[PDB]
Structure formats: C-alpha cells, structure tokens
Ligand binder design. Structure first.
Ligand SMILES: [Cu+2]
Length: 123
C-alpha cells in the first residue's frame, strides 16, 4: 500500500541512513520519502532498476513519492551522501530479475556495505 521512508543524519541503523533501508512492496505501491533530517534526497541507482522505470532525483530537504508497478529491484541513493553509504532497496514481486546486478553493480564501498545488507533482506 503505502511505505514511509525516513531520511536521517543519524538513526538506529547508523550515520547517513534510509529508514527503513529495505522495503518489500507490490505493484501499485507507494513510497513516501520523508525529510526527518535536512540535507538529504533520493536518486535512482540506475544500475539497479527494472527496465521500464523512469530515473528520478529529488530536491534536497524536500519530500518525494515514487510509484512502483514493475517487479524486481529498485535501488535508491542519496546523491551527496552516496559515498557515505546512504542507500535503500525496494523489492517488488518474487525472484527479482535484476538480482545478480544489484549484488554486482559498482558503487562506493560504504554504499555497497549497506546495499548487500538490505539485499540479504530480499525474499
Ligand atoms: Cu544524505
């Protein structure tokens, strides 16, 4: 249905952080991105995106909403704190076609650290 993601300087998970960092959703489902902390945004990791999905990037300190219809893995990052490891992951539907790629897509060490972490949450 609807899924709220907080964008945090600091959180229970760590520093520069999407909470929740992983989201299971289904077609039609809505992702509300929410500026709990200023200085963040949410851009698409295009080497983690189902084919047919439009690239996107949000204005800093402001809100954002993505709509999901296409199954698979949607990768997201915060543009200025990408290399600080601030990333998220949304899986829609069973056995995502872009699975291996998520695991293999080249990104900042810290981003990759947390990506694989939200990746082990896939079902
Ligand atoms: Cu950030």
């Amino acid at each position: 249905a609807t899924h709220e993601v907080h964008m945090l300087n600091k959180g229970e998970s760590g520093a520069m952080v999407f909470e929740p960092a992983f989201v299971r959703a289904e077609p039609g489902d809505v992702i509300n991105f929410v500026p709990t902390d200023k200085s963040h945004n949410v851009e698409a990791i295009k080497e983690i995106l189902p084919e047919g999905v439009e690239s996107f990037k949000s204005k800093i300190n402001e809100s954002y909403t993505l709509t999901v219809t296409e199954p698979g893995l949607y990768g997201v990052k915060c543009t200025p704190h990408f290399g600080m490891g601030m990333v998220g992951l949304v899986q829609v539907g069973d056995a995502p076609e872009n699975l291996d790629a998520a695991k293999t897509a080249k990104m900042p060490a810290k981003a990759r650290e947390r990506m694989d972490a939200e990746l082990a949450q896939v079902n």
